Amino acid sequence: TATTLNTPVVIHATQLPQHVSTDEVLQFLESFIDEKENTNLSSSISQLKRIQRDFKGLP
Amino acid sequence: DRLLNSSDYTQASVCRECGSILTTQQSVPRIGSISTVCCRRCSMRFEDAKKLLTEDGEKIFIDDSQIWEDGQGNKFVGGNETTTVAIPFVLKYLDSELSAMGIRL
Amino acid sequence: GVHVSYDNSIRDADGTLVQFMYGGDAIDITKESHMTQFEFCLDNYYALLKKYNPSALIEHLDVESALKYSKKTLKYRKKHSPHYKQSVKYDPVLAKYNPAKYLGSVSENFQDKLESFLDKNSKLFKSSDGVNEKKFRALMQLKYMRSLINPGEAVGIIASQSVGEPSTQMNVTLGIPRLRE
Amino acid sequence: TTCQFLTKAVLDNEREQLDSPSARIVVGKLNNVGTGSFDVLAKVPNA
Amino acid sequence: MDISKPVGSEITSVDFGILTAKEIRNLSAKQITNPTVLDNLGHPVSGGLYDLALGAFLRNLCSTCGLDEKFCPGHQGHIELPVPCYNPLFFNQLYIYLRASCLFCHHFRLKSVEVHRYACKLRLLQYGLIDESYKLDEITLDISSTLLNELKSKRSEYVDMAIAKALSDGRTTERGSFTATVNDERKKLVHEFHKKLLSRGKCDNCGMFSPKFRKDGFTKIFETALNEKQITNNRVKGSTYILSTEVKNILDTVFRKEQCVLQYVFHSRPNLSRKLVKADSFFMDVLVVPPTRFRLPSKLGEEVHENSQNQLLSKVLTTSLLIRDLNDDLSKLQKDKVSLEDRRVIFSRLMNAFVTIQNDVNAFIDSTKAQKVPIPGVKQALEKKEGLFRKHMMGKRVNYAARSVISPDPNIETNEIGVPPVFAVKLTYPEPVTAYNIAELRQAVINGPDKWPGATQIQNEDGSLVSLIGMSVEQRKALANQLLTPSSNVSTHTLNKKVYRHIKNRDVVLMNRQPTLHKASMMGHKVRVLPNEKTLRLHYANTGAYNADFDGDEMNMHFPQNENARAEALNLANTDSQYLTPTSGSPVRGLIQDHISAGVWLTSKDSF
Amino acid sequence: NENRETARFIKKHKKQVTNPIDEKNGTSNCIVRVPIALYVSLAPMYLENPLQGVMKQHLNPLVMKYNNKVGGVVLGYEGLKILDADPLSKEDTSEKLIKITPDTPFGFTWCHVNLYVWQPQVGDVLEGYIFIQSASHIGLLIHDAFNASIKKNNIPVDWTFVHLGHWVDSNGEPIDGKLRFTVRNVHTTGRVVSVDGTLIS
Amino acid sequence: MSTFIRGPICGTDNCPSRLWRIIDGRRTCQYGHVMEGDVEFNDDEDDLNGLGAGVITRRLNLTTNATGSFQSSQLTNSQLLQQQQR
Amino acid sequence: KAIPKDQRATTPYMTKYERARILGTRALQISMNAPVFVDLEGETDPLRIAMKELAEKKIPLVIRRYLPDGSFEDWSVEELIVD
Amino acid sequence: KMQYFLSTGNLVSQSGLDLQQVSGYTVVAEKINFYRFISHFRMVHRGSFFAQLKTTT
Amino acid sequence: MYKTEKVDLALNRNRGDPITQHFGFGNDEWPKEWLEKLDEDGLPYIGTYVEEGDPICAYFDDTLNKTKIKTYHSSEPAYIEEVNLIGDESNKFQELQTVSIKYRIRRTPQIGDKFSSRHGQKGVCSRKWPTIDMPFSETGIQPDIIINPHAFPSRMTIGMFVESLAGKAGAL
RNA sequence: AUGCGA
Ligand SMILES: [Zn+2]
Ligand SMILES: [Zn+2]
Ligand SMILES: [Zn+2]
């Protein structure tokens, strides 16, 4: 991903970020990973799942 | 298609913050650092950097002269004919300039 | 830089307006040749009706607004049929309705010649099998709409070539010295 | 008199709005005449 | 061009404007100080015109990007001019503004309130409010400073009303208002303005008698003596050559003290940038250094001739070194210089050397401003008769094009062009491969570059190019069975391979014949490959549109490389759409000579 | 005037937030959700899945990856919205419109999406499970995602070696499992992000 | 032996061979694939009025465009020539 | 700049310039694996494919007619009278 | 020097030899055809300077 | 059509010095297929067919320790008609540094090649008509050249008509 | 630039 066909030309935020709670973070993790599970990005999702476990309690 | 696409069509760097396509350069990489596009005009010499009144960490990029820079990371690529680059040579010698506009600068 | 805006006005690529219509009729030269050859169109009427069949398009436009202005303008024109005593109450029909949208918005010169043809040929309309000056007039209006200059035409350049190219074949100064002067 | 018009332009700090077809060619831009008189977009399904 | 590499940062306009020495120093990749060009009799001199920081050279990586001559875009250096040079291009300007000032007060010799009136008019013409610009003259009422300042108040109030209204009315915008007529009224105004500025033959703000200013023509200004009546009149109100430096400090002070008017004087549109109008714009305190890329030597066959810019610029470096030598006299002289009056020759070095450096900088800009056939400068490169703009911008050479003598042929269509197999094998279309064209393109690849409907090259979606020019039937056969492989990298998954196929019977080509006197002389034809031809084959029906004749006429055949160019050349420029000319609407395409006599004989009632 | 340039340095180099320690017992909320607007290309082959097109093209490579612009490794995205090129809807429609470049079949569009970013800062005190122990560093892994290492020089000499041997803490027992550290630096310039930790503050 | 590379190698496939297609203007892989450079320079048109005193002239100390990727050479001291003639 | 559709005042017909550009761009997209909405019916030239799509209005494109003011009218192929 | 002048046709001297031009005096015999060869020696030129004139008188 | 080429070794100025390149070889590693064109003295065999790319001479420069060749670059083949060795004007020149090679390029009448009568009525050959397809006279002949009549009404080259009838009489 | 094909 090195050119327009892969990388965004421009990115701007429109407000100052919002500090997602642990509960909001975990709910996002489960919803995002669950929606994604349904291609090397899957492997990064596996790391996200470990993050889920780390934000779930236990490695 | 003819007078460009089939002749000197070049995707050239332009600084979205300085409106020129000739200050752009490839910044020097390192064993842990890739080549990054930097705009010379949109960067400060690391010897100054308000250092007297003042870092993010990753906005200094280095020249083949091993010179540290701050900024210059706002340049992009746009399609133009290369002779255009030829103009800054003479016109830019003439002490004039192109403010090559783009998008949201 | 000189081209046709989408509003039929000739603007330069700057935006400066040059003419409110192309030659004042919005007619393409590459169309005009028969746009005033009515009798020819008539003897080949059914073919042109097969080309320009209006029933496909009669749903996309208005066939009256321009025709109605044609009615008021026909009134002032029959009343005022001296030049400085102009139709100041009635601009030409091309001024009031986009000629590509309301069939009948046509130069008064073209309208006049067309009607004069219909009057001087009423006897061919008394020699035909199935044709009338209302359906024939409808056809000629539709041909006129279909001869209009397209939005975006490079008419500036076209003009320049139409003066240059034939000037290569070329009491007072004539020819190139006159044109250069 | 390219340089003379150049001088009068720079002294004005002029900005080219890059409408002239020649100028538009200079920057390698779709010519504004004819087929470049308009833009084309696409209707795409959102779901 | 590649359809596979879009960009979405197109330029929307181009601003013009003067550089700044601090800008140059900050962007400058290097200062070039050494008038040397090569070193070790054969090496790029450190800190000279060919320093490697200015790009790549002869295997040496660009010392600023470490990139080869095939990659480093090059970087522009700069020269620190010992003294501020006059900018030739604006030299007439700085001259005018010099003659317009007052030398005892350093103000413009026009009434301050009248000047402010001029600034008002030019401000209203940034917004193009012409009616108000003319309506401004009417505001009218020993004259008190309170009253002339009252005119300035009322006039500024008029600016506030006409602007506030016009922005309220949307009859302009923050970005100004610009049309051909506004530009015209501006140039007219600025001209009469220049006439008023020149008209004052004595000061008004200060009443002082300024000296007459004379100039050499392109390197010196002189200051004429005054009359004892005017000199003693100036005291009761209480030609010499001058250097550029003094001019700079004077025009600096005048241009700063008169910034308020000049802010609108130097812009035809609102200066949103709050840019100071500085006198250093007309002078060159420094000189840039072009990219090495554009300074490459003239090698003709084997012999490589030095770049003419390098020559003139080296002349700048030598002359500058001489000025460094006079500065050697100042550091040298130093010790008071009481009566060592000989400095009269070193004074010849400063005056002569200094006018010399200016003359040489001018010469580097414009050959016709220096003092047989002196290498042309950038002005000559850009114009001279037609110029760089005309010879390499308004028209260029183009790739995918051919030229050959045209030969008639009645058996082809009137919309086709017979392409000789010499051209049929060397003109390609970059065909993206699909599910519907896989068979045809696999076959074309199988044929290879040296046969009919084949393809010379394959461009991967990864960006790589694969030439088939020299691949064996085995290797091309193998690649034909690999043309449809799947994606490999998420960076490239959206693309499909490309095949550079030979031109074939489904391609349209844009034929052009010499004096394009009119658009009808350059039409799109459907390509028809003719075997055993060597010349571009053409139907007679076109010869009255090209004004062509087989006596020996040559035609350019252009092969467009893009589906937009195909669709336009098949739909707009195509020959059939060119059956009538716009000049008259007379048909330009019909049978000719022999076909006419055949029609006369065949169509006789006597022919059965 | 000489203060425009210092306003340019401070106003250009301003920092948005200082993620604090959650409850002052957790970790700094360096994880934040920020809605952004990106401008991405759309190929024609995704012309029938435009939200999925934009996803597979630009957003999928962004997860588990550092963004200089956001200042961190994208933790995830929320609420993608393609900005319609043409006014009037009921903030919604069965088809959108998008600009095609004036040269090629590729599309370009505005996009609005919420990003979940891990935005760590220097000084945050964090705990990690010891990855490695070499005589110049201790490797740890934050949340099982971010690699962190504290080099010997940044570790207090009061720490104790036990022979890649086994470091023993300043208290007099060897370290094990999780370690609490302050963030000195985060090294992202390379193929993988590295978090610079300290044991001396 | 000597090595290959004193200019370019195909970083794609590990094939260190190079082709010249003078008709293409292309430097390409002798065995494998792709474009080794799109850029191609110096084969001027019909416009060399020769005002250029072109004082430069090659002398083998500024190298050469290397237009031969074919190489072997050796380390040199600097113009054998005198040692050759000796 | 958006001239409302209810207010569109321009030519119901596609200019030859419009037809040309639409056919070029749409052909190019189909040639880049845009989903074909019509029977390929054997064809191999993407341009004639785009012509088939134009004849059926399957083209999913809209014309942005510019006015020198900057106002524009967004027109579908499926409405602008093809010929 | 005379090979010089004969190889370029730029005859230059401090008198200008009373000639309106300083080039074009010499031509390559161009033996591509016997007709061409004999024709050079029967060619007579009004001189380049009149080639520069705009009129045709 | 004959093209003459000068292969010069005037590589080094200074009016002589070193001069070291000699037509021939040294490393043997050269492609022995070069013998297919150049004699073991480095010059092509007079008479040799050459096609684009073939070496026109071979020599050796001690500076490069390599056997180099000057290639012929054209779109069409020729034949080497004569190769002339130039030692002339030289004082010593023992190295044989100047060689002149003359190429013979045959030019067959071809579609597009120009032809003209003595009447300034010039025309390109549009095609090489098969003899069977030519028109044949009752004398049993088919013409050499066919010129379109439609040319005469504008040009009024009636002298060419007279030359036709005079050449016909004069042959009979 | 000089001569020349178109
Ligand atoms: Zn910049
Ligand atoms: Zn560099
Ligand atoms: Zn004064």
List, as one string, the DSSP characters of chain G.
---S-SS---SSSS---EEEETTTTEEEESSS-SBS-S-------S-------------SSS--------------SS-THHHHH-
Give the residue before each break in chain E, using a C-to-N cut-off of over 2.5 angstroms; say none if it is continuous: 141, 238, 371
* Chain D CA closest to residue F53: D46
CA dihedral D10, D12, D17, D22 (to 10 degrees): -50
Pairwise CA distance, residues E534 & J107, whole Å: 13
Protein residues placing their CB within 5 Å of the ion ligand 2: E 62, 64-65, 72
Angle (CA) E276 E278 E280, round 5°: 145
Beta strands per DSSP E along C27-129: none
Pairwise CA distance, residues E501 & E428, whole Å: 5
Among residues E313, E317, E322, the alpha carbon closest in space to that of E354 is found at E322
Pairwise CA distance, residues F61 & F78, whole Å: 15
Among residues E430, E438, E496, the alpha carbon closest in space to that of E462 is found at E496
Pairwise CA distance, residues C147 & C140, whole Å: 10
The overall longest dimension of chain J from CA atoms, in Å, is 76
Tokens of F25: 């017992």
Region for residue J147 given its phi and psi (left: phi exceeds 0; alpha: psi -120 to 50; beta: otherwise) = beta
Exposed, middle or buried: residue B78 (CB in 10 Å: 0-12, 13-18, 19+)? buried
**Are E295 and E307 spatial neighbours (Cβ–Cβ below 8 Å)?**
yes
* SS3 sequence of chain B: CCCCCCCCEEEEEEECCCCCCCCEEECECECCECCCEEECCCEEECCCCCCCCCCCCCCEEECCCCCEEEECCCEEEEEEEHHHHHHHHHHHHCCCCEEECCCCC
Listed in sequence order, the residues at least 6 apart from B32 whose beta carbon sits closer than 8 Å to its beta carbon are F187, F189, F190
Residues counted in chain B = 105
Pairwise CA distance, residues C85 & C107, whole Å: 19
D21-25 — which CB contacts under 8 Å span 24+ positions?
D21/C1, D21/C13, D22/E394, D23/E14, D24/C13, D25/B3, D25/B4, D25/E393, D25/E394
**Are F86 and F1 spatial neighbours (Cβ–Cβ below 8 Å)?**
no
Exposed, middle or buried: residue C22 (CB in 10 Å: 0-12, 13-18, 19+)? buried
Compute the distance from residue F40 Cα to the ligand 1 centre, in Å.
Answer: 23
Q: How remote is the C-alpha of J53 from its chain's centroid?
A: 15
Paired strand residues for J57: J70
* Residue C4 dihedral angles phi and psi, to the nearest 5°: -90, 125
Tokens of G38: 């799109």
**Are F149 and F194 spatial neighbours (Cβ–Cβ below 8 Å)?**
yes
I24 CB contact with strand K at below 7 Å: yes
Inter-axis angle of helices E344-365 and E308-333, to 10 degrees? 160
Tokens of C89: 């109450």
C-alpha radius of gyration, chain H, whole number: 14
Paired strand residues for F126: F181
Tokens of E468: 């088939």
In the three-class reduction of DSSP (H, G, I as helix; E, B as strand; rest coil), residue E536 is classed as: strand
What is the extent of the structural domain holding J3?
Answer: 1-108
Pairwise CA distance, residues F100 & C122, whole Å: 55
CA distances from E531 to E213, E419, E423 (A): 78, 9, 11
Distance C27 CA to K1 C1' (A): 49
Region for residue E139 given its phi and psi (left: phi exceeds 0; alpha: psi -120 to 50; beta: otherwise) = beta
Pairwise CA distance, residues E351 & E120, whole Å: 43
Number of Cβ within 10 Å of residue G25's Cβ equals 14
Pairwise CA distance, residues H8 & E292, whole Å: 55
* SS3 sequence of G46-64: CCCCCCCCCCCCCCCCCCC
Listed in sequence order, the residues at least 6 apart from J3 whose beta carbon sits closer than 8 Å to its beta carbon are J78, J102, J103, J105
CATH 3.90.1800.10 fits B1-105, yes or no: yes
Nucleotides of K under 7 A from a protein CB: 1-3, 5-6
User: Do the chains contact at H17 and C57, CB–CB below 8 Å?
Assistant: no
Pairwise CA distance, residues H19 & E347, whole Å: 76
Q: How remote is the C-alpha of E263 from its chain's centroid?
A: 26
Q: Closest-lying ligand to the alpha carbon of E100?
A: 3
Name the structure determination technique. cryo-EM
In the three-class reduction of DSSP (H, G, I as helix; E, B as strand; rest coil), residue J23 is classed as: coil
The two beta strands, E455-459 and E401-408, are unpaired
Region for residue F142 given its phi and psi (left: phi exceeds 0; alpha: psi -120 to 50; beta: otherwise) = beta
First to last CA, chain B: 28
In chain A, what are the helix, strand and coil shares in percent, each to the nearest 5? 50, 10, 40
Pairwise CA distance, residues B84 & B89, whole Å: 9
**Are E589 and E545 spatial neighbours (Cβ–Cβ below 8 Å)?**
yes
User: How distant is the Cα of F39 from the closest Cα of chain E, in angstroms?
Assistant: 9
Q: Is G1 on the interface with E (CB under 8 A)?
A: no
Q: Which fold has domain C26-150?
A: Tetracycline Repressor; domain 2 (1.10.357)
User: Do the chains contact at E594 and J111, CB–CB below 8 Å?
Assistant: no
Number of Cβ within 10 Å of residue F97's Cβ equals 20
Q: Say which residue the tokens 């003066």 belong to.
A: C163
- Chain E, 514 to 573: residues with Cβ < 8 Å from chain C are 517-519
Q: How remote is the C-alpha of B91 from its chain's centroid?
A: 18
Tokens of E281: 């714009």
Pairwise CA distance, residues E264 & E122, whole Å: 6
Among residues E333, D46, E342, E61, the alpha carbon closest in space to that of F84 is found at D46
**CB pairs below 8 Å between C and D: how many?**
30
Beta strands per DSSP E along E385-515: 401-408, 416-419, 428-432, 455-459, 465-467, 498-502, 508-512
Listed in sequence order, the residues at least 6 apart from I21 whose beta carbon sits closer than 8 Å to its beta carbon are I47, I48, I49
Angle (CA) E235 E240 E244, round 5°: 110
First to last CA, chain I: 37
Residue type, E278: K
Q: Where are the alpha helices (DSSP H) in E207-341?
A: 228-236, 244-257, 259-265, 308-333
CA distances from E321 to E34, E310, G10 (A): 9, 16, 47
* DSSP designation for J101: E
Pairwise CA distance, residues G79 & F72, whole Å: 57
Which helix (DSSP H) or strand (DSSP E) does residue C106 occupy?
none
The two beta strands, J78-86 and J66-71, are unpaired
Pick the CATH number of H1-83 from 3.90.940.10, 3.30.565.10, 3.40.50.720, 3.40.50.10190: 3.90.940.10
The two beta strands, E536-538 and E416-419, are antiparallel
Strand order in the sheet with J2-8: J2-8, J98-104, J78-86, J49-50
C-alpha radius of gyration, chain I, whole number: 14
Among residues H57, G63, I37, the alpha carbon closest in space to that of E56 is found at G63
Pairwise CA distance, residues E309 & B94, whole Å: 13
CA distances from E41 to E32, E298, E410 (A): 19, 18, 66
User: Do the chains contact at C14 and D38, CB–CB below 8 Å?
Assistant: no
Pairwise CA distance, residues B6 & E83, whole Å: 46
CA distances from J160 to C43, J121, J152, J164, J168 (A): 50, 9, 9, 6, 12
Domain residue spans in chain H?
1-83
Tokens of B98: 């192109």
User: Do the chains contact at H64 and D42, CB–CB below 8 Å?
Assistant: no
In the three-class reduction of DSSP (H, G, I as helix; E, B as strand; rest coil), residue F32 is classed as: strand
In the three-class reduction of DSSP (H, G, I as helix; E, B as strand; rest coil), residue E550 is classed as: coil
* Residue F140 dihedral angles phi and psi, to the nearest 5°: -140, 165
Protein residues placing their CB within 5 Å of the ion ligand 1: B 15, 17-18, 39, 41-42
Residues counted in chain A = 59
Of E13, E90, E269, the CB nearest to D7: E90
I45 CB contact with strand K at below 7 Å: yes
**Are D2 and B60 spatial neighbours (Cβ–Cβ below 8 Å)?**
no
Pairwise CA distance, residues B76 & A12, whole Å: 15
Angle (CA) G59 G63 G66, round 5°: 125
**Are E407 and E550 spatial neighbours (Cβ–Cβ below 8 Å)?**
yes
User: Do the chains contact at C15 and H11, CB–CB below 8 Å?
Assistant: no
The two beta strands, J55-61 and J66-71, are antiparallel
* DSSP designation for E209: -
Q: Quick one: which residue's CA is nearest to K3's C1'?
A: I27
User: Do the chains contact at E580 and C30, CB–CB below 8 Å?
Assistant: yes
**CB pairs below 8 Å between E and G: how many?**
101
Tokens of E184: 């015209």
In the three-class reduction of DSSP (H, G, I as helix; E, B as strand; rest coil), residue A59 is classed as: coil
Pairwise CA distance, residues E156 & E161, whole Å: 9
Q: Quick one: which residue's CA is nearest to K2's C1'?
A: I24
User: Do the chains contact at G22 and J73, CB–CB below 8 Å?
Assistant: yes
Domain residue spans in chain B?
1-105
Angle (CA) J75 J77 J79, round 5°: 150
Paired strand residues for F110: F39
Among residues E355, E367, E362, E375, the alpha carbon closest in space to that of E287 is found at E362
DSSP labels for F92-136? --SEEEEEEPSSSS-EEEEEEEEEEEE---TT-EEEEEEEEEETT
Number of Cβ within 10 Å of residue J163's Cβ equals 15
User: How distant is the Cα of D45 from the closest Cα of chain B, in angstroms?
Assistant: 27
In the three-class reduction of DSSP (H, G, I as helix; E, B as strand; rest coil), residue A13 is classed as: strand
Pairwise CA distance, residues C76 & C73, whole Å: 5
Q: How remote is the C-alpha of E57 from its chain's centroid?
A: 26
Pairwise CA distance, residues B80 & B5, whole Å: 9
* Residue F73 dihedral angles phi and psi, to the nearest 5°: -95, 120
E549 CB contact with strand K at below 7 Å: yes
Number of Cβ within 10 Å of residue J110's Cβ equals 12
Tokens of A11: 């990115």
Listed in sequence order, the residues at least 6 apart from E79 whose beta carbon sits closer than 8 Å to its beta carbon are E31, E32, E33, E286, E287, E288, E289, E313, E316, E317, E320
Residues 473-532 (E) near nucleic chain K, CB < 7 A: 514
**Are I21 and I50 spatial neighbours (Cβ–Cβ below 8 Å)?**
no
**Are E281 and B92 spatial neighbours (Cβ–Cβ below 8 Å)?**
no
Considering the domain A11-55 in this protein, what is its CATH number? Answer: 6.10.250.3390
DSSP labels for H36-83? P-S--TT---HHHHHHHHHHTT---EEEEEE-TTS-EEEEETTTSB--
DSSP labels for C108-142? HHHHHHHHHHHHHTTTTTTT-SS--HHHHHHHHHH
Among residues H60, G34, H30, H22, the alpha carbon closest in space to that of E434 is found at H30
Protein residues placing their CB within 5 Å of the ion ligand 3: E 102, 105, 107, 203, 205-206
Residue type, E557: M
Paired strand residues for E428: E502
Of E58, E298, E466, the CB nearest to G54: E298
The sign of the CA dihedral G59, G62, G68, G70 is: positive
Residues counted in chain H = 83
Tokens of F130: 């010891």
Pairwise CA distance, residues J51 & J132, whole Å: 35
Pairwise CA distance, residues F10 & E112, whole Å: 41
I23 CB contact with strand K at below 7 Å: yes
* Residue C48 dihedral angles phi and psi, to the nearest 5°: -70, -35
E554 CB contact with strand K at below 7 Å: yes
* Residue E115 dihedral angles phi and psi, to the nearest 5°: -60, -50
**Are E343 and E337 spatial neighbours (Cβ–Cβ below 8 Å)?**
yes
* Chain E CA closest to residue J10: E302
The two beta strands, F146-151 and F194-198, are parallel
Which helix (DSSP H) or strand (DSSP E) does residue I5 occupy?
helix I2-8
Pairwise CA distance, residues J148 & A7, whole Å: 66
Of A5, A40, A41, the CB nearest to E494: A5
> Cβ contacts (< 8 Å) between F99 and chain D: which residues?
39, 41
DSSP labels for E573-584? SBGGGGSB-TTT
The two beta strands, E416-419 and E522-529, are parallel
> Cβ contacts (< 8 Å) between B80 and chain D: which residues?
27-28
Residue type, D5: F
Compute the distance from residue B65 Cα to the ligand 2 centre, in Å.
Answer: 10
Residue type, G18: R
Pairwise CA distance, residues J38 & C70, whole Å: 91
